[model samples]
Target: IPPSLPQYDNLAGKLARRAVLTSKKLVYVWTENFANVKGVPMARSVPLGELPNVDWLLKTAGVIVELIVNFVASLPASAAAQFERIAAGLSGDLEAARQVHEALLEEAKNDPAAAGSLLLRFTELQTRVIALLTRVGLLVDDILKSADGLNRFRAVFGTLRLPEVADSFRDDEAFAYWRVAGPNPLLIRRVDALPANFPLGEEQFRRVMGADDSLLEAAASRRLYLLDYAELGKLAPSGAVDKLLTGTGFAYAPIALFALGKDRAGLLPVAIQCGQDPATHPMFVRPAESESDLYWGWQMAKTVVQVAEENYHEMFVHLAQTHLVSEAFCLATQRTLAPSHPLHVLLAPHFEGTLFINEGAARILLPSAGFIDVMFAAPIQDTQATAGGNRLGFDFYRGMLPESLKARNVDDPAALPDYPYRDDGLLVWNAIRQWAADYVAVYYASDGDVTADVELAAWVGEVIGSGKVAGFRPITGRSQLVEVLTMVIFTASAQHAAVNFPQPSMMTYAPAICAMSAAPAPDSPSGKSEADWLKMMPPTLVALEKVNIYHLLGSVYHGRLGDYRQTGFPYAPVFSDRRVTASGGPLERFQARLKEVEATIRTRNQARRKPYEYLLPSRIPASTNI
Candidate 1:
């Protein structure tokens, strides 16, 4: 935790309760106008935020975010005094309000969208809070819901078997060359496959939906929708031509990357969205001309570039060795899994060359605990899912962590204990992941475990209209919000580099939906005129059609930020046996070996240097001079 804070319990307890009220305020604001929008559920059909059914539950969560903020904000004298007053003020109102809140909640639970609206409203508001909350929220709510027991976040690198491949890939000449001297070929291949239209047969759809649910069940549960570019006809859902006019690329970073091209795509790989193959599957496409089409596609590219330049350098440059180490630990864990995976050993503990394990203690730490055990706690109310469960890690972690760090006292007001360990943002992350996954799953699933493509698609559409979902901005376009947040953090504190240097923005994205996202709305063009909007929106949208191609080609990994090849590198690396020379010792020998590896890989000639040759913008700031 930051040094300037007070004990978690004393500072956070009442604050959570008050924060709930604040969340309520925001919920009311959005839901009050929810029905007026097209495709929005009728308020009567949905639970009213004001209804007497599940208000307490909603209010309870609202307070959690608020409490977290107040807790952190309260340490300083100025902030502390204000927090104290807020907590005291709200404490008096708690019981009476709780009564009223619960009364309303019972009625709220019956209506899906209204319940959703309320939940979403809190999330949207929470997005603007501290980076920790946003990060925790994404893992708990977004990833855990879809991932179930499978940890998909680890897949961003590739479909390599865990542990081994992640270990010594660096020792091999091919891997080293790719890491320092060139781009990753596998990634290059995948980038080429991000936009193929896969026709969805029942089998293919099932793959994306997972084994637990079917399409029919989802539709019956009202969780499915078929979002197509055709829906936003005014936007002209053709190809790339339409995207340029509106600067639609700014909706999210991955979409922006598609608009910008190769250079930027390398930076923010996480923004790259993976979707079902559209041509071969029943998939959503924005034709070649729709603005909505452009916005979604370009956002992918934008995020990738951001991750590459901003996060990669920040994390790797200062703590490459430490990260290399962490990779090793990750590898060791992987090797312990069922089928031994080569990449695990290759990249983790045994890595060599310039490609070494991370060295500094994890500066950008993601918590292993503090999340809802989807394998155990998910489906929230389903006791059966929790049966026959081996909660070894969770139970063990409970003992390992301190009271303050543990989940039991997270929202408690009287608990004033300090954490035993220091972490980047893990504590709160655990709680969010633990609780939020079920929450997101509830929203995404139409009924039970069925695939709700239409519902998911509709939610995607709503995201297009609102520029948000579950309280977070789904994209990072040219006018991207990350830059805005970056500017604010920079201006507010000299510690801006400390707070904003890495990929804090990673938490703000919904990579699952962004890769195969819905098309942009017609009016989303940033220009003052409709024609101007028309000009910029087409090309970007056209990019969406090809997004699936990038994924298949290996341009984007599931949890990854972006591909290195698309940035500015001329080639990718291949591997050789680990070797060492006496010249400068291990470090020098490693760097040299990496260079040798680089030479063996394929390099792009000048002929391949154009904008289309890569996947990001042709021009970047001279400061970034890639």
Candidate 2:
């Protein structure tokens, strides 16, 4: 939206992102194999395992050159001519290498043992390819130096793509739900039509929804049944999986799976993978509301809202309201491969991890219960626990909840058994509350200063309880009350900290804390083992590559406390009772800071919405100041 940037309608401007991504992808492939110890200055060496085929590398090199040309062709004639020369040089080199490869093949026909000679020849080609890649890299840098060059980088890879394990995952029916290109997650009418005020009756809420349907809920539940962590594990090893995490020009990243418009709702999977350059990678772009691809996901997200409204109380309602109707789900995770890499067959999905959540203008960091653990952890016989149990793992929770649509019906909520961890929600909350209290006390304590649990609880209750929190009230019905409270706690705990949009915080940290406190120990009746309790999992950081000023503030406000395991608490900000006044307290101060961010984004978006001419001055009084 800034004046210096190109409009979305500008085709040449749009091609810049993919051009950068393609060049970077080529860069990663080349450097990973040839560069000496990443980020270190040393002689380069090519590892045989890095590139399986020289032909593949050559083709990829050509693709990189072509993408760069496409990106720079619209500029000055000199720039276009410069790229053409570079392209021609690379082509000549590739052709010469191909001729050599053919000659070596002919020689191998006569002497069957000439395979070694061919290997040596291929290695020679690898060096030449690296040379070409080096030149391309410099040329790409040159293009980036031009006006609007950095803009293209941001336009392509502004979104943070969570890291994930890589191997051989296929694009099949099993993973159909996660395929961003398969179907859209926002299909229903935008739910933003409802008034901003909360505490509206169920009738009005239903009226705003237009259809008030639960048909999708049953379908989504069944779809969840078909998925498991093991199946998801099978997905990570695929090329599609790698492409999902890293947008290779044409492919969209996994974050694209969820729509971020005011009309959408529900949580989407969050993950992180190493070896990604945020500058050139593509970020998720929410589809237009009229032609959204998330219809299947939207239905289930709507179901979560319906369940919250009918079964829970004010806390759940308020939490749901933060994101359900007004903002897109911002949950994500870091997906790393196990030591026994590529053999996810033996690895259990990590259930113990950190979680984070937020209140109004808030960001909360807590211990985590890996998404799989929160969604699927339960007691099982040893035979069932280890054999199929590992297979079931926590994936039922991770990739399970959100899936494609079908017409099959399922049981109603009333007839179904109570959701697990209903009463135990209190235990989880209490433990986290205490942990936070202890953390703040330690963080702030000097020689004599100390904080009490009551003060901490007051602070938490005030931050989470105050604000434009709708439907917050005491309710009867112990089972429903506990369940709703548990959800409220979890929602608050699982909130994400991406400050790009106004939405609820993520609870990624809670799953570990909850599982640790609530799930039974290895020998207990609940049958959870030490492994089952995600203990001492390190904290995670989530942010966009091209971070704005607001994101920096959000990171400090949201980053984990240092070494929570050693300190008995994760990352937490210290707040004193003096700072917790009736208004504009520590939490309120942070909220106000976020308001500045909100205002900044609002102004920029407004500028973008206006016509291009309005952004320009009426008179052209050119000055030498330029």
Query: Which candidate leads the pack in lDDT?
Result: 2
Off by over 4 Å in 2: 1-52, 76-78, 148-205, 208-626
Q: Which candidate has the highest TM-score of all?
A: 2
Candidate 1's displacement at residue 617, Å, is: 25
Please provide TM-scores, in order, for all candidate models, with all chains considered together.
0.21, 0.27
Tell me the spans in candidate 1 whose CA falls farther than 4 Å from its real position: 1-197, 200-282, 287-502, 505-587, 591-626
Q: Rate the local accuracy (lDDT) of all candidates.
A: 0.25, 0.25
Name the weakest run of 10 consecutive residues (lDDT summed) in model 2. 617-626
lDDT of 1 by residue, 553-595 (tens): 1211111011111111111222221221234533243334334
Clashes of 2: 53
Q: Which lDDT value does model 1 have at 490?
A: 16
Candidate 2: tens digits of C-alpha lDDT, residues 1-626: 21111122256534653354344333222111111112111112212332324543455455554444444443467757756777667667766776765676577667866556566666776677767766765764454344211233223212332111011011112122222111111111112222222122333222322344222332233211111111112111212111111121111111112111122222222111110223332222111244334332322222222111111111122222223211111111011111111111111111111111121111111112111111112211211122222222212112111110111111222221111111122223333333333323323333222222222222223222321123333332233223333333233331211111111111111211111121111121122223432321111111111122122222222112111111111112222234332274433443344334334434543543111111011110000000
Candidate 2's displacement at residue 514, Å, is 34
Mind sharing the TM-score for model 1? 0.21
